[PDB]
Subunit: 328 residues, 6 copies
């Protein structure tokens, strides 16, 4: 060994201390034997995750787990285990797994704080892009409080972290650490016309992660509020000079339904009779989908939200009490 | 929660960013369009980019390709307030443009002006812009190369002295600042080399030394006056067949510097046969093998100069004097 | 400058001091003038490399040189020289060149050590991406001991260094240096759906390069041990369904054949007379080839190694002595 | 007209007389209004067919009907009717429909004979290519007894008539008539790299259609003999290298299993325990399936047929009795 | 060698061809272009097509899409002599055009004019043209269908009464004759339906009955006068969203027939909201479900006619009289 | 059987009488055994041919035979034979094969005459498109005396027959018969943007075929004259107002070489010194490649052709005696 400089030494260390907490995740799919006609389990995906606690809980992106007839997590030392799906939140693309492993081979990553992050501080991403086990890439926090389309549901994910640390396919589910060797986010997606890292990557912030992992380990589900309306996307509403959100449907069996919000119908000659248009929700104004989403993201089941609509050419105000989203 | 002590290196990048992001702006290129349903005149964004604040008088600098073809321009300040921007002037060849905003002198932080002539490969650089609409994104890198010549199809005419960096630069970054570790402007990010159209680690910035000169001239006279030889010539991969080792002058307007001086254009003998004209083979002693060489030479010239251009005419060369004049 | 930081100052110095050792390599092909139709030489591709010693030996990837009528290397001061091929190793994509030039123009690149590298340390890549003469990109060692498929032709390369320092077409053959300004690897390939840099580049370790250059300089080729076996790909060992490397042909001359390995055959009808199937080599369990290769990749010509095959519903152990390919 | 020629005059008459029997078939799917989001029915595809009898039975290709919420047939006079599916045979892409309409609006198409057809005779195709209501194209019988892969799903169709009368998407289900103005086949598919007509269209022979319509009308399905075997494709019987149809699974219930055919298996390790392999069925030599299929395609449920397999370096002959698929 | 006795059927097709090929011509569409080397004005073919001789006065008929955008036209007679052609006039809607040639009256064989109204499906047809430049190619087929309506993007406005044939028709055939077995003009080949852009057995011809009328009018007055309602309407797949069961009139110029009569255009209430206008639902009693229906209706109308158009306006229909005027 | 009409009966008959003369040809290529590592013969192409004589000679397109490690011809009754390549002419894409077969299973097609063909007479094509054995397609002669690019060499093939009888991949090498049940051409290519029959197909005329088959059976080669010059293609000569054919090279060892025609060279400064330009060849004028080709197509080895060139701005006349093209 040669004498390494301060800085690089700090990252060399940070990596050795934390790589043990990172794991490889395999999404095995069912395939047929061309002759045996029976089945064989065979990898259709690769991703990462980290150890959350001594009880064998593993965190990752839900999109990495989606559709796996079976999934196995490989730990640092290469010992591979079978994993049970503890639970998951599709909106924030967070998922929790559990494995039966000896507490000695489990390092839970030190949990940090994402609320105090500053653009410019250094970050460290560890994951498995292209199957390269426990790859380290470094960069900087490029941005904070970003909103990105979930695609895991389409619903927007608020408060996302942006980094220019190389993030490629296979990094999803792995950790983003700060200079303190602390977890600040889960690497989950990128913006790139090629599908290759283009220097713009996103991580779900640790703060929203920790809450979700708690709820997931306790109840195996996260309960989120709904208004009970299907609205028109910002696009197919563009050509109507529509200020806010056009409710297309408010099922009689949901919150806005029981609260009497009107849906969009048809003239009898076939013309469109616009349903209510949400222009504001208790205080905060709503000009499009993101605004609505963002605002409800702050509510909890049971809250009595006061929503303002633009009904037949005259304003309105309606109180709706948010109920949990129907299960399945 | 209290922030964690950051290392000195990263802490610096954090200061540089707090200090300069406010000087960065977002620019919107609007163009007139037909309303689909009421067939009226509508204003609609067709592209966006970056820029920075130059003086307390409201002068915004950006790339020309950003404001090009614009019907109307809006610049949005860091604090999200937006102003209408007037085109002070621009230099299509060096892809630089100045805009004027009527905003409060306190909402305007001129960017520290640096020096590009003494930069060294390996120096740390900082890019701030709006790649993919991501507001004031900070990406970090190093100076990868100096004195690069990139042929910007955004004029055609090549550009030289350009800075090369491996800080991530993506669509949306054009027009934003490139800072040195001292937090001073050293270039304006304008293009990249990429098969994908996305950052691949090879980005270019027009050097501050070139920009200072141009902004100065645009503010003071509304234009940049550049000399011309007054000829239209055959692009390289067009005469590469004939073995032409220079610029095959296609047209020397009798009205321009080269025509009034006697250069002979290409011509057909009515018999169909192509009787080519003068072939420039050097100007002020500098060899001219391709159109770029000619360009580079003129780059270093001033209007009113008496350049001596050599030409291969009818089996012998011969030097002719041409007096460069301003572009009309 | 306006007072550089210590860290950036170190980069500045490192580039300043080593860019002289890097070179530009232009691979010229023979073409035909389209009007006169006389033959002429024109560039087929370009890459980089670096100076190895005061004798004028230049190192780069073999894939930079493959299929080139003539080779020309341009030194940092723009002066060019015709280049002779001293030798090259296809399996490790390393090639040595020799140019005839002024000893005061050759700065041998300081040679480092790759066995001690640690993930996270700073690296420096110098090369000519996109024709961008002596570009410097910077990153960290992202992974060590990686195994990437023959970035030239076939056999897996072992011990590959992974880095997120921007590496692009044109960087092939150039040096990857550590913070001590020493050669730790040769930038040679990348993983990318775009074909350009996306953060994962690989470079062959200097330790491996040191050896091969040395050999090439002296014997103009490097001797490698061979088993004397031809086998089926990991994808053809699937449907048949078994862990191991199936022997498809053991030339009676090639060691494995001397020893008694049986090749695959076709019975009177047409079905498969399943020749041997290697499942272990003197210890290590083989099962695909990345294995058989990986392991065998550490033997020397001569090393009598025991190979565990399988044939009659029973396993067996044959003793084979390694020889070199001719 | 200005005095038509006898030949064109015959075409004119033939179309004039039979276009009444052709119909338009629109396949409607369930969709969602994008603003009101109530469900609605909208066209998924269209095809043609023809009237079979005064009861309102309509004949077309099953592939014209597959996956349709509701079926509507439009008669030559533009009047439409909802259609009920009477039955259909997937292997011969034939389907019967029944509509409720005026007997004075149904012209049963004169039914011809396909067994006597000769290459070179004139044919007449009527259908709705590209929505072109009752288009008439003309050509000759280009080939007889052709075998084209299941223009619906799987099994080869036999006895297919080939023609160069322009056949395009939309013609599927329509009649192909001979010069006697009689039904000789159902236009069902084409060979084309463009996806549109290039001169080789195929239509299932009326003899085959006559039978299936009849069956469907009565039992609402047609019974077919099955061997009770699952086998590998002609492309997986390649690498192993042997003429024959390899048995991959003989369900102990399915006749072949009752008889004692052994399926392919995997030995303790993972290699292939090569189950049986059919090389002949009571006479005809099988070797791919187009064969096994072709042959077996002429048996009736019950027909005890001897099948020649192969297992222990020797051939053997098992007696199997055909049953129908449930 | 002596020719072999041909069958009567084929012998006829051989006569029909000997007799008519001389009346067929080749047409060249030349356009002005920049000479690459001497940057001068050059004449250069950009497309070719077919046509036929109409009278001894040198009138050539062809499709309009063939001569469209032409800078200069040359027609080549069967005997390979070529003449410059002047545009007599054309009807963009029925894609028909007449040209005039100054050639010797003996080199001109007018084509026999037939009748298209009494054609029958199954009749034998003969097409002569220049597919892919193949001089006076003869292709044979049958009349496949009558009264077809094809929407020629070569105007947009649909065309009706069109003949469908399975005689091979390929690029290069446009503008050439379609003959019946009596050797008389019955249509002019103009388009085909094909995924490949090449004959797939579905070709269309504009019927002779429509052509006779148009050529006549073009020769006599240089133009075809067609009526207008004076409205610009919303294309179908544009309002299909609103449930509009007719033509949603977007604009009724106050200067035109529909405006002077009172039809109301679509409009936004400055509040952004899209307040749509009249929706035509029938004209002279004929239902109007889509733009084509309206087109077809007007097709059968004459200028100066007082058409009564029904409109869905503010919850009720109401018939309004409009007096059709000539196209400007 | 039903009573068939005159016409169809004639074709039914023609087909049964001649289908026996048609054969299927298989182009087997060498492929490896993934395990055996030895070789297997495996079809890479399919085409047709017909029996030329009782001695087992089979005719086909050369392009069908090109590159076959082995080729086998299947006769009517399905008996497949191994075939020896008697010889071939690449210019006219004609090839002759020989097989060892019992004279009783060999019907040589009746040879007709192509010189008297008339556009409009009926034709019958028999071949194997898409592997459909002995497919019959009928149509008409659409054109005569056409010139098409050989692609088998690029050299143009003169005097080609055009038919609208469906001709697809797999028809090459099969016969085109006239109503007399006589061979009038070999189906060999088509014009189609899809690769599927588009109604424009070509056959090499029987007259030129018969000569070539004779020479091929006698000497196994056809001897064709050459001028001994490589010229510039009509394209890369376009921009030079070049009237005729620009000779690029006239090797000193060939006819025009020994006769002293000049090649194109380079100025010494790199400019182009045009070699001779052929404007005429003994009588007939030459304006481009096709003209030259076409004209030499009429000469025989040994002919002393007088060629006119445009040398350095003054005309010329040079006698060249054509020599056989060097073998290989």
């Amino acid at each position: 060994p040669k004498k390494l400089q301060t800085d690089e030494l700090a990252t060399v260390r940070l990596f050795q201390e934390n790589t043990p907490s990172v794991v490889y995740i395999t999404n095995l799919a069912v395939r047929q034997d061309a002759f045996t006609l029976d089945v064989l389990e065979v990898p259709q995906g690769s991703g990462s995750g980290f150890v959350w606690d001594k009880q064998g809980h593993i965190v990752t992106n839900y999109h990495v787990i989606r559709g796996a007839s079976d999934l196995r997590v490989t730990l640092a030392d290469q010992t591979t285990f079978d994993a049970k799906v503890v639970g998951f939140d599709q909106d924030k693309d967070v998922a929790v797994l559990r494995i039966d492993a000896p507490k000695n081979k489990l390092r839970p990553i030190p949990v940090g704080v994402s609320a105090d992050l500053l653009v410019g501080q250094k970050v460290f991403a560890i994951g498995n892009p292209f199957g390269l086990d426990h790859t380290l890439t470094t960069g900087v926090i490029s941005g904070l409080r970003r909103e990105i389309s979930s695609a895991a549901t389409g619903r927007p994910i608020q408060d996302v972290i942006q980094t220019d640390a190389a993030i490629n396919p296979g990094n999803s589910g792995g950790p983003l650490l700060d200079s303190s060797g602390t977890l600040i986010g889960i690497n989950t997606a990128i913006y790139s016309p090629s599908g290759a890292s283009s220097g713009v990557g996103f991580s779900i912030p640790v703060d929203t992660v920790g809450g979700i992992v708690d709820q997931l380990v306790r109840f195996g589900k996260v309960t989120r509020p709904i208004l009970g309306i299907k609205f028109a996307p910002d696009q197919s509403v563009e050509q109507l000079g529509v200020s806010g959100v056009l409710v297309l449907d408010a099922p009689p069996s949901g919150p806005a339904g029981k609260a009497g919000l009107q849906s969009t119908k048809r003239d009898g000659y076939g013309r469109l009779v616009l349903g209510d248009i949400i222009t504001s929700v208790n205080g905060t104004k709503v000009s499009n989908g993101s605004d609505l989403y963002r605002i409800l993201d702050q509510c909890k089941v049971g809250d009595e939200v006061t929503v303002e609509v633009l009904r037949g050419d005259h304003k309105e105000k309606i109180s709706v009490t948010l109920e949990p989203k129907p299960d399945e």
